[PDB]
């Protein structure tokens, strides 16, 4: 990914994360737990869905037969037809290849972007209360129970509540 | 106490190409090139005329094999390889132009 | 066949599809996906897969 999160500083994906694209995995006195983030997951889904809406569609132009499979047309005009058709085949094959390559590059970079955005959103939330690990983990200095972890996920987390304890723990 | 971010992956991904790499494995992929044919003329909702032994140009002159197609009405006209325009041997001048006209005639 | 509906026809039958491209017949007529040489062009609908 262009941003360097997916297949980047985040070592690998979670096969257990079946409910979402992106999620949180925590460690605290109470144990371990994993939860998907739907806002980031939905943003990625909506954008991929948009590409498919664009690519799966009508070319309303209807083309009639201009040659004949049973009784071949004159050879001069027939050769012009075939040359023109083969030229169009070449253009469209090239177009299709480039479209899919371009869209795939963007799709991968897009997913990588959404992962990065979620990470940075969390980093800003708990400023001066935690430090970046480098594996996509935040080491939190104060005690953070399941209600505290769920507040981070929820986005209600209040850093000023735990700042004195966390800051002083450095 | 720490919280960790991640993304899901699958043991068996699907390979795609990008601008920068061949065979990149992704969670998901959907084919954009149709390969599946239906081996029938799917004619629901259209008045269809299957000419069979009658050649399209025979509908105008009327050799015996075209007796049932002398005044046909159609949205979709189907020519077959076995179709013949003639009984007494011969052929039309500018035959394919005329076929193209009759194919669009209704 | 009056039990299926399609708008793309060729000598071998009917191309029923919503896909943008097809590799079935370069002389298909009606309202058709555009013929391409390639048998397959997979479009990514998800992130890069990075398994453990």
């Amino acid at each position, epitope marked *: 990914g262009l941003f360097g999160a997916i297949a980047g500083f985040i070592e690998n994906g979670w*096969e*257990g994360l*079946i*409910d*979402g*694209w992106y999620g949180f995995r925590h460690q605290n006195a109470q144990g371990e737990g994993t939860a998907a983030d*739907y*806002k980031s*997951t*939905q943003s990625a*889904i*909506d954008q*991929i869905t948009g590409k498919l809406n664009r690519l799966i569609e009508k070319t309303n132009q209807q083309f009639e037969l201009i040659d004949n499979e049973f009784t071949e047309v004159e050879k001069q005009i027939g050769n012009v037809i075939n040359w023109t058709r083969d030229s169009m085949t070449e253009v469209w094959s090239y177009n299709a290849e480039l479209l899919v390559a371009m869209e795939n590059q963007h799709t991968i970079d897009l997913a990588d972007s959404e992962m990065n955005k979620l990470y940075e959103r969390v980093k800003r939330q708990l400023r001066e209360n935690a430090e970046e690990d480098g594996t996509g983990c935040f080491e939190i200095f104060h005690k953070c129970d399941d209600d505290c972890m769920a507040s981070i996920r929820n986005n209600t987390y209040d850093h000023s509540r735990y700042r004195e304890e966390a800051m002083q723990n450095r | 106490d720490k919280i960790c971010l991640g993304h*899901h992956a*699958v*043991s*068996n991904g699907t390979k795609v190409n990008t601008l920068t790499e061949r065979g990149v494995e992704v*969670v*998901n992929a959907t084919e954009t090139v149709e390969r599946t044919n239906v081996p029938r003329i799917c004619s629901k909702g259209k008045r269809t005329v299957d000419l069979g032994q009658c050649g399209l140009l025979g509908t105008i002159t009327g050799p015996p094999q075209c007796d049932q197609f002398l005044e046909f009405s159609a949205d979709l006209i189907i020519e077959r390889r076995e179709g013949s325009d003639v009984c007494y041997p011969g052929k039309f001048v500018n035959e394919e132009a005329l076929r193209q006209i009759l194919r669009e005639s209704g | 066949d009056a039990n299926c509906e399609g708008d793309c026809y060729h000598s071998g039958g009917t191309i029923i599809s919503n896909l943008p491209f097809q590799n079935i017949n370069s002389r298909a007529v009606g309202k058709c996906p555009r013929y391409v040489k390639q048998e397959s062009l997979m479009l990514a*609908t*998800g992130m890069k897969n990075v398994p453990e």
Partner: antibody
Amino acid sequence: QVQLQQSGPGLVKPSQTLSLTCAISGDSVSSYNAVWNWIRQSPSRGLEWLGRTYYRSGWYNDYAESVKSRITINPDTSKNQFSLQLNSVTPEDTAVYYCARSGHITVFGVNVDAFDMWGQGTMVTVSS
Amino acid sequence: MTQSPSSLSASVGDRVTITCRTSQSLSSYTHWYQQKPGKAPKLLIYAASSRGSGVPSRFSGSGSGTDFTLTISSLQPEDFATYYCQQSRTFGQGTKVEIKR
């Protein structure tokens, strides 16, 4: 033609254990493309998800916070079934219990928790 | 998930619209179920706008932000059921559809 068939007693004494089984046919309890759930329904509480199990190169379980302390859902890969075990039942656990497959139906490979097939239900009464 | 109305009567052939109001809006995660008496719920609409397997064309779903709608274009006697929407693991309280005949 997936079919979920449910068994287990519909009468449990208060404080004891409710035990139900869902036997799967047409699909595998350890399939990558399935999630196996329990849901209950009461005229009061309505429809309430209880928990699940699934296999993705290892077994996972998730449970509803309301029953987390009492509940176990285990796969049996010998009989292609999965069970519900609910400990210390109270009259508030009286309900119809359904097993259900999700995650067969997905948006771009993400389980969106669509329950595409359900068992017939087991009516459970907690009473002495 | 919160449904409106709690119940309704409508004549055969009527257009019926049911609404789900959701805490948080995600098109992908909201699905609808139809439950007939003594039976398990059957999934009608999934991902908000997609019809379940075996589901007739008169049923359709729409979504807009946090508001989601199930529509029966022409009501039929056999559609007598209670309808529940669902987002993630929470089920709306249901809408009872009774037929006026």
